[PDB]
C-alpha cells in the first residue's frame, strides 16, 4: 500500500447529504502528499447554499494521507488497505444538538484517490449553532486516537472536535469512527497511537459558488 503514496496523488471527494430534510451535495478536488502529511483541496456546494456550516463537514470530507514516521510505518492501517480501499463510518454527536451519521468508501479509481460519502443528520435545533450558522470559519488542531479492532480486522478511532462559536464559546462534536477494509486482503493492525492534525480554511476570491479551500497537515505520533 505504501508505494502508492510516495508521490503527489490527486484526490476527488463526492458527498451527498441530508440534514433535517435539507438535501445537498458537495464535490471537492485537490491533491495529497503523504510524504509531508499535506492535503490541499477545494470543495464546492454543487446544489446551491450549504445548509450547514462548512467547518462542521471538514472531518467527513482521507487519513491515508497522514505522514507516518519511519519507525511507525507498520502501524499505518490506512495505506495498508489500498488500493482496494476501506469503509469509514462515523456518528458525530454535536453537544446539545443533533448528530451526523456518515458512511464513506475511500479507494483508488485509477490513479485518483476517491472519498465517496453519504451523510445523514437528524435532530438538529433550527435555532442551534449548526442550523443557525453561528460557527466561525476557522478550525483548531486536534489529536485523533486510533486503536486496533482485531475482531473486525479494522480500527476504532475517537476524538473530540472543538468548533469556535462567534460569541466566543465552543461547540463540541464527539466523533466515534470505525474503519474496515473493502478487500479480503491483509491489513496492518496498529498499536494505540494518534494523529496530530492542523487545518487552515480559506476562500477563493474569484469563486462565486458556496465553497471552502482547505490546507491540512497530519502526522502520526505516540510511539
UniProtKB/Swiss-Prot annotation:
Entry comment on modification after translation: Contains a chromophore consisting of modified amino acid residues. Maturation of the chromophore requires nothing other than molecular oxygen.
Biotech utility: Green fluorescent protein has been engineered to produce a vast number of variously colored mutants, fusion proteins, and biosensors. Further generation of mutants led to more stable proteins (at 37 degrees Celsius for example) with brighter fluorescence and longer fluorescence lifetimes.
Stored InterPro entries: GFP, GFP-related, Green_fluorescent_prot
Mutation effect (residue 157 to A): In GFPB; leads to enhanced fluorescence at 37 degrees Celsius
Record note on what altering residue 74 to R does: In Azurite; shifts the excitation and emission spectra to shorter wavelengths and increases quantum yields compared to BFP
Outcome (variant: residue 139 to A): In Cerulean; leads to improved quantum yield, a higher extinction coefficient and is 2.5-fold brighter than ECFP
Keywords associated with the record: Chromophore, Luminescence, Photoprotein
Tissue expression remark: Photocytes.
Domain of life: Eukaryota
Effect in UniProt of substituting residue 165 to L: In R10-3; matures to the red-emitting state with excitation and emission maxima at 555 and 585 nm, respectively
Function: Energy-transfer acceptor. Its role is to transduce the blue chemiluminescence of the protein aequorin into green fluorescent light by energy transfer. Fluoresces in vivo upon receiving energy from the Ca(2+)-activated photoprotein aequorin.
Assembly information from the UniProt record: Monomer.
Similarity field: Belongs to the GFP family.
UniProt name for this protein: Green fluorescent protein
Organism in which the protein naturally occurs: Aequorea victoria (Water jellyfish)
Amino acid at each position: 500500500g505504501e508505494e502508492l503514496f510516495t508521490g503527489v496523488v490527486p484526490i476527488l471527494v463526492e458527498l451527498d447529504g441530508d440534514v433535517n430534510g435539507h438535501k445537498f451535495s458537495v464535490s471537492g478536488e485537490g491533491e495529497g502528499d503523504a510524504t509531508y502529511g499535506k492535503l490541499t483541496l477545494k470543495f464546492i456546494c454543487t446544489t446551491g447554499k450549504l445548509p450547514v456550516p462548512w467547518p462542521t463537514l471538514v472531518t467527513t470530507l482521507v487519513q491515508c494521507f497522514s505522514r507516518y514516521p519511519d519507525h511507525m510505518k507498520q502501524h499505518d492501517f490506512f495505506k495498508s488497505a489500498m488500493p482496494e480501499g476501506y469503509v469509514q463510518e462515523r456518528t458525530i454527536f454535536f453537544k446539545d444538538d443533533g448528530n451526523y451519521k456518515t458512511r464513506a468508501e475511500v479507494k483508488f479509481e485509477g490513479d485518483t484517490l476517491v472519498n465517496r460519502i453519504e451523510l445523514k443528520g437528524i435532530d438538529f435545533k433550527e435555532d442551534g449553532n449548526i442550523l443557525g450558522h453561528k460557527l466561525e470559519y476557522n478550525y483548531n488542531s486536534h489529536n485523533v486516537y486510533i486503536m486496533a479492532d482485531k475482531q473486525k480486522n479494522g480500527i476504532k478511532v475517537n476524538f473530540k472536535i472543538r468548533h469556535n462559536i462567534e460569541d466566543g464559546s465552543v461547540q463540541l462534536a464527539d466523533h466515534y469512527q470505525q474503519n474496515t477494509p473493502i478487500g479480503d486482503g491483509p491489513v496492518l493492525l496498529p498499536d494505540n497511537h494518534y494523529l496530530s492534525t492542523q487545518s487552515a480554511l480559506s476562500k477563493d476570491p474569484n469563486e462565486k459558488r458556496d465553497h471552502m479551500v482547505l490546507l491540512e497537515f497530519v502526522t502520526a505520533a505516540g510511539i
